Short mmCIF file of C-alpha atoms in Angstrom, two decimals:
data_model
loop_
_atom_site.label_atom_id
_atom_site.label_comp_id
_atom_site.label_asym_id
_atom_site.label_seq_id
_atom_site.Cartn_x
_atom_site.Cartn_y
_atom_site.Cartn_z
CA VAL A 1 -9.76 11.83 2.16
CA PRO A 2 -10.95 15.58 1.78
CA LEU A 3 -11.27 17.63 -0.79
CA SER A 4 -11.08 21.13 1.07
CA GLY A 5 -8.72 22.19 3.63
CA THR A 6 -7.01 24.62 5.79
CA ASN A 7 -3.80 25.74 6.87
CA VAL A 8 -2.23 24.53 3.51
CA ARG A 9 1.10 24.26 3.41
CA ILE A 10 3.73 23.99 0.41
CA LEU A 11 7.03 22.42 1.46
CA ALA A 12 9.94 22.21 -0.31
CA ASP A 13 13.00 19.59 0.35
CA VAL A 14 11.15 16.54 1.12
CA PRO A 15 13.42 13.81 -0.28
CA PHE A 16 11.18 11.39 -0.84
CA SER A 17 8.70 10.52 -3.64
CA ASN A 18 5.43 8.26 -4.78
CA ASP A 19 7.89 5.81 -5.61
CA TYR A 20 7.94 4.99 -2.52
CA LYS A 21 10.97 3.11 -1.84
CA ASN A 22 11.91 5.07 0.92
CA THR A 23 10.20 6.85 3.94
CA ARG A 24 10.84 8.96 7.35
CA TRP A 25 9.20 6.71 10.40
CA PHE A 26 7.82 8.35 13.31
CA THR A 27 6.92 7.04 16.44
CA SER A 28 4.41 9.87 16.81
CA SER A 29 2.16 12.27 14.98
CA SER A 30 3.49 14.89 17.26
CA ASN A 31 6.89 14.05 16.06
CA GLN A 32 5.88 13.51 12.26
CA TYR A 33 4.31 16.91 12.72
CA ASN A 34 7.52 18.75 14.05
CA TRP A 35 9.36 17.13 11.31
CA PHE A 36 7.53 18.38 8.55
CA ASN A 37 7.23 21.94 10.49
CA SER A 38 10.87 22.79 10.35
CA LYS A 39 10.31 22.16 6.26
CA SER A 40 10.58 25.57 4.25
CA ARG A 41 7.00 26.66 3.46
CA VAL A 42 7.21 27.48 -0.34
CA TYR A 43 3.67 28.67 -0.08
CA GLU A 44 0.73 28.96 2.40
CA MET A 45 -3.44 29.44 2.45
CA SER A 46 -5.58 29.65 5.04
CA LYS A 47 -8.66 27.93 3.28
CA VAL A 48 -8.74 26.33 -0.26
CA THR A 49 -10.99 24.20 -2.62
CA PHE A 50 -9.44 20.70 -4.51
CA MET A 51 -10.61 19.92 -7.88
CA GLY A 52 -10.32 17.48 -10.28
CA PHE A 53 -12.97 15.68 -10.34
CA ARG A 54 -11.53 13.18 -12.66
CA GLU A 55 -10.00 10.72 -10.20
CA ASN A 56 -5.82 10.82 -10.06
CA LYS A 57 -5.93 14.64 -11.37
CA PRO A 58 -6.25 16.41 -7.55
CA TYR A 59 -4.88 19.58 -7.75
CA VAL A 60 -5.06 23.20 -6.23
CA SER A 61 -4.84 26.54 -7.90
CA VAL A 62 -2.31 28.79 -6.87
CA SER A 63 -1.61 32.65 -7.65
CA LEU A 64 2.19 32.10 -8.46
CA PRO A 65 3.98 31.75 -12.05
CA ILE A 66 4.80 27.91 -12.81
CA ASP A 67 8.50 28.76 -12.41
CA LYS A 68 8.08 29.68 -8.50
CA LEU A 69 6.89 26.70 -7.31
CA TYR A 70 9.81 24.05 -8.99
CA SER A 71 10.69 23.86 -4.95
CA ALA A 72 7.48 22.41 -4.42
CA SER A 73 7.54 18.50 -3.22
CA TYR A 74 4.99 18.25 -0.86
CA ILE A 75 1.88 19.33 0.74
CA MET A 76 0.28 19.38 4.14
CA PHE A 77 -3.40 20.32 5.04
CA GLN A 78 -6.20 19.59 7.76
CA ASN A 79 -9.59 19.86 7.34
CA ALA A 80 -12.06 21.49 9.61
CA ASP A 81 -14.25 19.13 10.13
CA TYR A 82 -11.61 15.92 11.07
CA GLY A 83 -10.13 17.83 13.59
CA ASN A 84 -6.29 18.05 14.08
CA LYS A 85 -5.33 15.35 11.72
CA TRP A 86 -2.46 16.29 9.09
CA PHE A 87 -2.95 14.91 5.36
CA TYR A 88 0.24 14.70 3.78
CA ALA A 89 1.03 14.58 -0.01
CA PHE A 90 3.23 14.34 -2.99
CA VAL A 91 3.49 17.26 -5.15
CA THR A 92 3.68 15.24 -8.90
CA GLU A 93 3.50 17.80 -11.33
CA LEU A 94 2.77 21.90 -12.10
CA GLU A 95 0.62 22.71 -14.80
CA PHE A 96 0.43 26.06 -16.37
CA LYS A 97 -3.21 27.11 -16.34
CA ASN A 98 -2.52 30.67 -17.20
CA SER A 99 0.62 33.02 -16.23
CA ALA A 100 0.56 34.14 -12.68
CA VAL A 101 -1.86 31.10 -12.03
CA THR A 102 -0.42 27.05 -11.75
CA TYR A 103 -2.52 24.28 -10.65
CA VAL A 104 -0.83 22.49 -8.21
CA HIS A 105 -1.12 18.59 -8.85
CA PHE A 106 -0.57 16.22 -5.45
CA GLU A 107 -1.00 12.34 -4.76
CA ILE A 108 -2.06 11.77 -1.03
CA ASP A 109 1.34 10.37 0.20
CA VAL A 110 -0.74 7.52 2.07
CA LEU A 111 2.14 6.33 4.34
CA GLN A 112 2.92 9.57 5.97
CA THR A 113 -1.37 10.37 6.11
CA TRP A 114 -1.99 7.00 7.64
CA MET A 115 1.28 6.24 9.92
CA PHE A 116 -0.47 5.95 12.68
CA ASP A 117 -4.00 4.07 11.89
CA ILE A 118 -2.18 1.02 10.09
CA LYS A 119 -2.10 -2.64 12.05
CA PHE A 120 0.20 -4.63 10.69
CA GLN A 121 -0.82 -8.23 11.11
CA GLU A 122 1.11 -11.70 10.40
CA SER A 123 3.01 -11.44 7.12
CA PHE A 124 5.11 -13.35 4.57
CA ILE A 125 8.53 -11.52 4.99
CA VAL A 126 10.49 -12.08 2.21
CA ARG A 127 13.25 -9.82 3.68
CA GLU A 128 13.88 -7.72 6.93
CA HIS A 129 16.37 -6.38 9.34
CA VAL A 130 17.00 -8.84 12.15
CA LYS A 131 18.92 -8.85 15.98
CA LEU A 132 22.80 -9.68 15.08
CA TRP A 133 24.29 -10.38 18.08
CA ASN A 134 22.99 -12.28 21.45
CA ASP A 135 23.53 -10.68 24.48
CA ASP A 136 27.14 -12.98 24.80
CA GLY A 137 28.86 -11.92 21.75
CA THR A 138 27.56 -15.07 19.86
CA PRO A 139 25.93 -14.88 16.66
CA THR A 140 22.37 -15.16 16.14
CA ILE A 141 21.08 -18.63 13.52
CA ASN A 142 20.39 -17.04 10.10
CA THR A 143 20.83 -19.63 7.58
CA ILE A 144 18.15 -19.16 5.07
CA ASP A 145 19.82 -19.68 1.62
CA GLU A 146 20.55 -16.10 0.20
CA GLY A 147 21.42 -17.62 -3.36
CA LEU A 148 24.45 -14.99 -3.26
CA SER A 149 27.72 -15.94 -4.54
CA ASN B 1 33.54 -48.57 22.95
CA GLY B 2 29.65 -50.56 23.89
CA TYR B 3 28.46 -50.43 20.22
CA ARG B 4 25.81 -53.60 19.82
CA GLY B 5 22.53 -54.52 18.68
CA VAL B 6 20.67 -51.71 17.05
CA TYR B 7 19.81 -48.08 17.37
CA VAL B 8 17.04 -46.11 16.23
CA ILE B 9 18.23 -42.33 16.02
CA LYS B 10 15.04 -39.86 15.96
CA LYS B 11 15.86 -36.62 13.89
CA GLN B 12 14.13 -33.57 12.90
CA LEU B 13 14.53 -30.18 11.65
CA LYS B 14 15.84 -27.27 13.16
CA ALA B 15 14.05 -25.09 15.20
CA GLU B 16 14.67 -22.13 12.03
CA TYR B 17 12.97 -24.04 9.90
CA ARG B 18 10.40 -25.30 12.07
CA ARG B 19 9.27 -21.78 12.91
CA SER B 20 9.32 -20.87 8.92
CA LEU B 21 6.99 -23.48 8.25
CA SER B 22 4.93 -23.68 10.63
CA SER B 23 3.65 -19.94 10.44
CA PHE B 24 3.60 -20.47 6.64
CA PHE B 25 1.23 -23.63 7.05
CA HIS B 26 -0.61 -21.70 9.83
CA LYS B 27 -1.73 -19.04 7.53
CA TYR B 28 -2.26 -21.11 4.42
CA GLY B 29 -2.64 -24.31 4.93
CA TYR B 30 -1.00 -27.05 2.97
CA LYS B 31 -0.22 -28.32 -0.70
CA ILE B 32 -3.78 -30.54 -1.65
CA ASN B 33 -3.69 -30.94 -5.65
CA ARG B 34 -6.59 -32.90 -5.51
CA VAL B 35 -9.74 -32.42 -7.29
CA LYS B 36 -12.54 -32.28 -4.52
CA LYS B 37 -15.03 -29.95 -2.77
CA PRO B 38 -12.89 -27.25 -1.01
CA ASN B 39 -12.88 -27.21 2.98
CA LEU B 40 -15.02 -23.72 3.60
CA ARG B 41 -15.25 -23.85 7.27
CA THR B 42 -13.86 -26.68 8.87
CA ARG B 43 -11.36 -24.78 11.13
CA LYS B 44 -12.73 -22.28 14.24
CA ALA B 45 -11.09 -19.09 13.16
CA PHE B 46 -10.20 -18.97 9.45
CA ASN B 47 -10.10 -21.35 6.35
CA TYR B 48 -7.73 -19.97 3.12
CA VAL B 49 -8.41 -21.58 -0.20
CA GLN B 50 -6.98 -21.35 -3.21
CA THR B 51 -8.22 -23.41 -6.56
CA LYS B 52 -7.30 -23.31 -10.16
CA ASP B 53 -10.36 -23.92 -12.78
CA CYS B 54 -12.97 -24.11 -10.17
CA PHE B 55 -16.15 -24.97 -10.74
CA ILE B 56 -19.34 -23.20 -8.92
CA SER B 57 -22.63 -22.98 -10.10
CA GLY B 58 -26.08 -21.56 -8.56
CA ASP B 59 -29.14 -19.01 -9.49
CA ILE B 60 -26.66 -15.98 -10.04
CA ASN B 61 -25.94 -13.93 -13.24
CA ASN B 62 -23.13 -15.60 -14.96
CA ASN B 63 -20.87 -12.41 -14.64
CA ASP B 64 -21.06 -12.80 -10.69
CA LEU B 65 -20.74 -16.24 -11.13
CA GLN B 66 -17.62 -15.76 -13.12
CA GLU B 67 -16.37 -13.46 -10.41
CA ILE B 68 -16.54 -15.72 -7.55
CA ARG B 69 -14.80 -18.58 -9.86
CA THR B 70 -11.91 -16.09 -10.28
CA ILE B 71 -11.98 -14.90 -6.22
CA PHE B 72 -11.32 -18.79 -5.34
CA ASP B 73 -8.73 -19.17 -7.79
CA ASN B 74 -6.77 -16.44 -6.46
CA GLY B 75 -7.07 -17.47 -3.61
CA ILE B 76 -9.12 -16.32 -0.07
CA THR B 77 -9.25 -16.34 3.14
CA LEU B 78 -12.60 -16.87 5.27
CA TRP B 79 -12.97 -15.71 8.28
CA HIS B 80 -14.88 -17.35 11.40
CA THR B 81 -14.46 -14.86 13.98
CA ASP B 82 -15.17 -11.65 14.42
CA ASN B 83 -11.06 -10.97 15.00
CA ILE B 84 -10.39 -10.84 11.20
CA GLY B 85 -6.72 -10.95 10.67
CA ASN B 86 -5.33 -11.94 13.93
CA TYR B 87 -3.31 -14.79 13.12
CA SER B 88 -2.11 -15.82 16.72
CA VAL B 89 -5.26 -17.98 17.49
CA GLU B 90 -4.94 -21.60 17.10
CA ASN B 91 -7.51 -22.32 14.54
CA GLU B 92 -8.15 -25.95 15.94
CA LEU B 93 -10.57 -28.00 13.87
CA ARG B 94 -14.33 -27.93 14.12
CA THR C 1 22.95 -0.03 -11.32
CA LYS C 2 20.25 -1.80 -9.63
CA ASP C 3 17.47 -0.01 -7.25
CA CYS C 4 20.14 2.98 -7.05
CA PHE C 5 20.24 5.55 -4.48
CA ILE C 6 20.49 9.21 -5.53
CA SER C 7 19.49 12.44 -3.82
CA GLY C 8 19.46 16.06 -4.10
CA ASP C 9 17.58 19.49 -4.51
CA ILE C 10 15.83 18.43 -7.69
CA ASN C 11 11.95 17.85 -7.98
CA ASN C 12 11.79 14.21 -7.74
CA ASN C 13 10.34 13.68 -11.18
CA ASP C 14 14.35 14.27 -12.58
CA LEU C 15 15.58 12.82 -9.85
CA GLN C 16 13.30 9.52 -10.50
CA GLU C 17 14.63 10.11 -14.27
CA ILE C 18 18.10 9.80 -13.35
CA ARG C 19 17.84 6.92 -11.81
CA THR C 20 16.36 4.89 -14.05
CA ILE C 21 19.30 6.06 -16.09
CA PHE C 22 21.64 4.65 -13.78
CA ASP C 23 19.81 1.89 -13.53
CA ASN C 24 19.87 1.31 -17.05
CA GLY C 25 23.64 1.83 -17.30
CA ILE C 26 25.52 4.65 -19.09
CA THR C 27 28.49 5.48 -20.06
CA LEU C 28 30.35 8.27 -18.91
CA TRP C 29 32.78 9.92 -20.95
CA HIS C 30 35.79 12.42 -19.86
CA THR C 31 37.20 13.33 -23.50
CA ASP C 32 35.83 15.01 -26.45
CA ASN C 33 36.04 12.11 -28.59
CA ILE C 34 32.94 10.47 -27.69
CA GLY C 35 32.59 6.90 -28.63
CA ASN C 36 36.53 6.15 -29.39
CA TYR C 37 36.56 2.63 -27.80
CA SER C 38 40.64 2.75 -28.86
CA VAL C 39 42.63 4.28 -26.28
CA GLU C 40 43.91 2.75 -23.37
CA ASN C 41 41.25 4.39 -20.57
CA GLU C 42 43.87 3.87 -18.07
CA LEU C 43 43.12 4.93 -13.95
CA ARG C 44 43.33 8.48 -12.42
CA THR D 1 -34.27 5.15 -5.13
CA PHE D 2 -30.80 3.95 -6.72
CA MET D 3 -28.94 6.68 -9.38
CA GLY D 4 -26.01 5.65 -11.56
CA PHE D 5 -28.56 4.81 -14.17
CA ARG D 6 -26.87 5.04 -17.46
CA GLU D 7 -23.40 6.58 -16.23
CA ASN D 8 -23.25 2.29 -14.88
CA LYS D 9 -21.33 3.78 -11.82
CA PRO D 10 -24.24 3.28 -9.39
CA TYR D 11 -24.73 5.27 -6.26
CA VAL D 12 -27.31 6.59 -3.47
CA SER D 13 -27.96 10.16 -2.78
CA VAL D 14 -27.67 11.29 1.02
CA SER D 15 -28.90 14.47 2.52
CA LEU D 16 -25.36 14.33 4.48
CA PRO D 17 -22.61 16.70 3.96
CA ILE D 18 -19.75 14.78 2.94
CA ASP D 19 -18.04 15.07 6.05
CA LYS D 20 -20.62 13.24 7.98
CA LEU D 21 -19.68 10.18 5.95
CA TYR D 22 -16.12 9.96 6.01
CA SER D 23 -16.42 6.66 8.05
CA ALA D 24 -19.02 4.92 5.70
CA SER D 25 -17.36 1.68 4.44
CA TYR D 26 -20.40 -0.74 3.16
CA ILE D 27 -23.92 -0.60 2.50
CA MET D 28 -27.04 -3.19 2.76
CA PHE D 29 -30.46 -3.14 1.45
CA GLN D 30 -33.60 -5.25 0.90
CA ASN D 31 -35.96 -5.01 -2.56
CA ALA D 32 -39.24 -5.23 -2.90
CA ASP D 33 -39.06 -8.23 -5.43
CA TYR D 34 -36.69 -10.14 -3.81
CA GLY D 35 -38.63 -11.05 -0.36
CA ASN D 36 -36.44 -10.57 2.95
CA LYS D 37 -33.24 -11.13 0.68
CA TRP D 38 -30.79 -8.61 1.48
CA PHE D 39 -27.95 -6.72 -0.83
CA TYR D 40 -24.75 -6.20 0.23
CA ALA D 41 -22.04 -3.76 -0.85
CA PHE D 42 -19.00 -1.72 -0.76
CA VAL D 43 -18.94 1.82 -0.28
CA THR D 44 -16.09 2.61 -3.10
CA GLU D 45 -16.35 6.80 -3.36
CA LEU D 46 -17.82 9.57 -1.76
CA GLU D 47 -18.85 11.83 -4.81
CA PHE D 48 -19.72 16.15 -3.29
CA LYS D 49 -21.98 17.28 -5.67
CA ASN D 50 -24.28 19.30 -3.25
#
């Protein structure tokens, strides 16, 4: 995961977070890009460098006052050296450095970023959504004890 | 109504629970609760191994040796083919 | 609540805090006499 | 030669741009003092210094 970016865009209104309880799943990267591309661009940069240096504090310097970046929720960017791949990241915290300069902290969204590179193998499934009705209108058989009154 | 003599009725668990338990056993073997040497390479594709308070010796700094004991006490899967993670295979003996 | 879902135009940090607040339980008052439990507290 | 010295976080210097190693996952090497013995290691982090 890169530490210098191109085509960088800071987005507003991305409805999921680094709690990772929810995400928007996609059938293709093209669809994924289109979805993010319909989000409001709070700020854009053609070429930028990332710092931190220390683990867990990666960020990008933006030349706006911290009040102007409150809507920021997400970042997407490309790296010139690994083709047309998009990297996606949560905006986690705005750090006031100077006035008229904010440090925008981000954390790589591992789901969105690696969505089509992951291969799921056989796993213990605690819960999932299953087929409810057979073709003939009869219920499927699911009798695992739910332990609910 | 034709009831005479003795009847042998053979019973087994339903498809739902067979699938459930079989898939669990396939990936994680059986509960053993024995003090013995572990089965490391007895299956063709993979061996799951989980110990408690295991004993492992060797010419190794004790730090690495302690790490290794911890690894088996936490449970680990030992693969015997290049197709790591593919659980569809039969994984028969030898 | 438990594992509540709450959305909105809010930095996710504040949104996460708010979910936490309802997951821990909270009392919402509809009068100025906050803390007075003697009242009937009927419907509507 | 290996570094990570006193820093206690071991690493090896490579003459490639960090983009040339993005696929790197593992290391193996021998030591003059341990015969033909092979040492194996996970790659944990790429650090850009130069």
